[PDB]
Design a protein around this ligand. Structure first.
Ligand SMILES: Cc1ncc(COP(=O)(O)O)c(C=O)c1O
Ligand SMILES: Cc1ncc(COP(=O)(O)O)c(C=O)c1O
Ligand SMILES: [Mg+2]
Lengths: 376, 373
């Protein structure tokens, strides 16, 4: 018997099984469970991969977005511009620090923050005069880099801080700049299903600013000052475990080949499916991390059921955009509302997508989708 | 070179069990909230005699989340020790409330109960902040004075979060540390009496509603469904791999607590007359996260121990109310002279369940020698 996985961690582990065992056993034996050598080693190796001078490992990708807001003093009285079509963390951290998220729609093709509407949202916030614009958190949704040149042009006028939410986009790139290396600071997650993932919770932050890096390293260890005995700011506890850094070192050594595989797999879906469903085209000069391979379909509920009847898993990202969820629905939304974010949940679907998807399994998936849409 | 807290000797004792447990998790691939997490919540719950255990990412988060559930924030006061690890006060600041620092007893090093009453009354009398909560710490594994604190909180309508970061395994009158107050919190930082091999934590309560709300907060404020968050939360989970480690640690904890009791009593009896020793009050078992004495010329003592290959550590060098980050917050009437003088004389010695008679004798010999005996 054979079967397919949505994101196949087992196939990946099989590839590097004994290397993972050794890396884990070394940490277990050495007894340096907190900030042991593998942590700094991973920060360095990931830094060179991404071309960023500073990598600050931490506990998870939510923490990774919160800490930069804390270092900038963002909090009560302050507005942070975020997509609604994203994972809750992007907006939640803004509320957690006492600031308000302001929700911006996404582009109907890239699923990433709409730049024109961002500009309008900032202008409306200034006109209302109740909050001060402080930051923008674009998301590289599904692995595809957001439009950082136009977003930064807006930030330049307004003095705003940009945090790249690269939770889903490690391995992605746009005109030879790696995802992670945009904005003032980048953030990611090593949640196990991400393109670069560990075997527990983990995260990191990225920046070329040495001062910002020093502040982040303070914040993640209770706001430690220049000495071991005096905390100079409010912080948190947000460390990447040595044991998870050891896992990540082995994941990182195969990430680039896996990115080639993902690109190959995505292109094969796009060429085979473009006439029956809406496919995620890769714009010139981009590589996506393909955290998800997301299509839009007529009768999407019908399609998903037929895929499951044929033993094919699929997932809807996202069922409820943030601005419609109870916790965030009272926060302000950009002028014009969020029609794209509101309508995508009725038609979007993510398909199995990982480096180990076989030709045969992909063919089967293609066949079911084409068949559903009346192709013989 | 002698270990301060010997995780190596502990690991050797359960080496194969740890390896099997870790192997199992690695192969199963349920790395987030895998079965070992719930298994561990159940077993720890049985050990502590609480109805609900909510595992989480670390002992700091474990203090923060209950404050969030209570809506504690701007305009509110939470009463805490200055003589403790930063997290105890930090989380109060982090939610927007203010810590109000209370001094500690010069023998137990735990929150002074009379001065807590003074502090609550004074904050009410002042009228700038509303009293919401108290976070006593079971410092070094010794339970705080919960009968008195609980009665005060009931009278004043305040919420008690027990900071049991250092006290799992400790008991007071047949009540387990972690089971006091409205909710308890702990750390599984590797050096704690119950520790994992990374960061981890947990919260404890008998209130089913609070437990459900805490399970929501630690996963971004999840509502009754998968797709609609109803409150602001965080990401605070205990990894499956660490739960697996913790199950093995828990299975030898009671024996280790007996060993720690034996080791500390032998220290107290042999050092009684040369230094101030941490006496165990009747009806208590301490978790002995640390074994803390006070000595004349403590700096000389520490250097002498170190010259003889024996590590020791000063907990704490700078009380929180003097630290830059917290120095602007209010202090209880009378000030905190105990918290301000302890750093000149306190010192913690090697303490763990595997301390050999030979190592302990050496340590004892050096301290007694230093003081002329
Ligand atoms: C876009 C985005 N941002 C932030 C996060 C939060 O990361 P973590 O899951 O490590 O808390 C996620 C989670 O995967 C995500 O998809
Ligand atoms: C008394 C006390 N409370 C809270 C904490 C925070 O726990 P964690 O280190 O798991 O963040 C510590 C850490 O040792 C502690 O000693
Ligand atoms: Mg962790």
């Amino acid at each position: 018997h054979h079967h397919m996985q949505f994101i196949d961690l087992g196939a990946q582990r099989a590839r590097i099984e004994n290397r993972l065992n050794a890396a884990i056993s070394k940490v277990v034996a050495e007894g340096r469970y907190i900030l042991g050598p593998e942590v700094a080693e991973f920060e360095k190796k990931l830094g060179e991969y991404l071309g960023v001078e500073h990598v600050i490992a931490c506990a998870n990708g939510t923490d990774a977005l919160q800490m930069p807001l804390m270092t900038r003093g963002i909090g009560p009285g302050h507005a942070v511009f975020v997509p609604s079509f994203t994972f809750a963390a992007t907006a939640e951290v803004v509320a957690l620090v006492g600031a308000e998220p302001v929700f911006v729609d996404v582009d109907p093709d890239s699923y990433n923050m709409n730049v024109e509407q961002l500009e309008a949202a900032i202008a409306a916030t200034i006109k209302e005069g109740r909050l001060e614009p402080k930051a923008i958190i674009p998301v590289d949704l599904f692995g595809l880099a957001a439009s950082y040149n136009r977003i930064t042009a807006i930030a330049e006028r307004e003095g705003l801080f940009i945090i790249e939410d690269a939770a889903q986009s490690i391995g992605g790139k746009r005109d030879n700049v790696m995802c992670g290396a945009f904005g003032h600071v980048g953030a990611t997650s090593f949640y196990p299903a991400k393109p670069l993932g560990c075997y527990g919770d983990g995260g990191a932050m990225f920046t070329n600013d040495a001062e910002l890096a020093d502040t982040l390293r303070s914040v993640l260890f209770h706001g430690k000052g220049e000495t071991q005995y005096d905390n100079v700011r409010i912080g948190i506890n947000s460390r990447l475990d040595t044991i998870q850094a050891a896992v990540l070192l082995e994941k990182l050594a195969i990430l680039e080949d896996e990115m080639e595989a993902r690109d190959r797999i995505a292109r094969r879906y796009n060429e085979a499916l473009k006439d029956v469903v809406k496919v995620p085209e890769l714009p010139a000069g981009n590589r996506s991390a393909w955290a998800q391979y997301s299509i839009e379909s007529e009768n999407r509920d019908g399609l998903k059921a037929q895929l499951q009847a044929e033993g094919i898993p699929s997932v809807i990202y996202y069922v409820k955009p943030l601005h419609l969820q109870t916790a965030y629905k009272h926060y302000s939304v950009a002028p014009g509302g969020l029609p794209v974010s509101e309508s995508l949940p009725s038609r979007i679907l993510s398909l199995p997508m990982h480096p180990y998807l076989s030709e045969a399994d992909q063919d089967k998936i293609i066949g079911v989708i084409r068949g559903f849409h009346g192709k013989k």
